[PDB]
Design an enzyme around this catalytic site. Structure first.
Site, PDB file in Angstrom:
ATOM      1  N   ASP A   1      -2.952 -11.657  20.727  1.00 53.53           N
ATOM      2  CA  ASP A   1      -1.986 -10.703  21.448  1.00 53.53           C
ATOM      3  C   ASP A   1      -1.316 -11.414  22.671  1.00 53.53           C
ATOM      4  OD1 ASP A   1      -2.548  -7.354  22.281  1.00 53.53           O
ATOM      5  OD2 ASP A   1      -0.994  -8.895  22.737  1.00 53.53           O
TER       6      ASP A   1
ATOM      7  N   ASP B   1       4.388  -9.334  18.744  1.00 53.48           N
ATOM      8  CA  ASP B   1       3.455  -9.671  19.573  1.00 53.48           C
ATOM      9  C   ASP B   1       1.884  -9.921  19.281  1.00 53.48           C
ATOM     10  OD1 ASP B   1       3.383  -7.555  22.489  1.00 53.48           O
ATOM     11  OD2 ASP B   1       3.183  -7.021  20.482  1.00 53.48           O
ATOM     12  N   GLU B   2       1.822  -9.225  18.164  1.00 53.74           N
ATOM     13  CA  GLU B   2       0.381  -8.937  17.413  1.00 53.74           C
ATOM     14  C   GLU B   2       0.152  -9.701  16.153  1.00 53.74           C
ATOM     15  OE1 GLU B   2       0.757  -4.691  17.848  1.00 53.74           O
ATOM     16  OE2 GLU B   2      -1.467  -4.994  18.674  1.00 53.74           O
TER      17      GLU B   2
END
Length: 205
Positions: A11, A105-106
């Site tokens: 993350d 973003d994961e």
């Protein structure tokens, strides 16, 4: 199970604002806010110095300026962040048996094969991945290592920023025991509030 998987969740920390700090080094250490418009404007991402003043994702820029006048406000440049994300995701791909890119973003990495089910080795692999993103892209990320995707993210949410959270196969059962339904990813505030009105607050209720 608690073996069939060794998952590494990645993350990126305050991603949009962090990419901006990477491009403009003079923003680092100062309150910074990336803005999104969809006519009128709101906070997309605030770095920590700005969150420290109370600025939050989703807050109207007007209310943000009122509480963080000294912050620098810049516009969202999505294409560039997509470019960064793209590169990082590709980098991750190379260390995973299988990869779920959940968002810009994961990302979830299945690495049971990769480290032949050795858990400790999975942790180290995660650590090496933290460093490799920091050097190849100068971005810091928080990771979580656990037996399944769900637990991997929870420990990760609890370890930011810039963390390495771990839940070994052996500490799982009791981890779940003190888990607030509140903390489960995907369980929105609305469902949570409704379970609460019913006195249901923990996984064991």
């Amino acid at each position: 199970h608690h073996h069939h998987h060794i998952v590494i969740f990645v993350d990126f920390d305050y991603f949009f604002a962090q990419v901006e700090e990477v491009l403009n080094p003079q923003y680092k250490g100062k309150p910074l806010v990336v803005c999104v418009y969809s006519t009128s404007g709101a906070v997309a991402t605030a770095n920590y110095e700005a969150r420290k003043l109370g600025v939050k994702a989703g807050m109207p820029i007007i209310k943000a300026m009122q509480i963080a006048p000294s912050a620098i406000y810049v516009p969202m440049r999505k294409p560039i962040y997509e470019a960064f994300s793209n590169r990082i995701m590709n980098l991750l791909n190379k260390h995973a048996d299988k990869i779920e890119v959940a968002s810009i973003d994961e990302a979830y990495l299945d690495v049971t094969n990769k480290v032949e089910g050795n858990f400790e080795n999975g942790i180290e692999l995660a650590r090496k991945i933290k460093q490799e993103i920091l050097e190849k892209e100068k971005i810091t990320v928080t990771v979580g290592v656990a037996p399944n995707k769900i637990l991997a993210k929870i420990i990760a949410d609890k370890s930011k920023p810039n963390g390495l959270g771990v839940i070994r196969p052996t500490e799982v059962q009791d981890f779940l025991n003190e888990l607030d339904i509140d903390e489960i990813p995907g369980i929105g505030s609305v469902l949570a509030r409704r379970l609460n009105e019913l006195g249901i607050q923990k996984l064991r209720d």
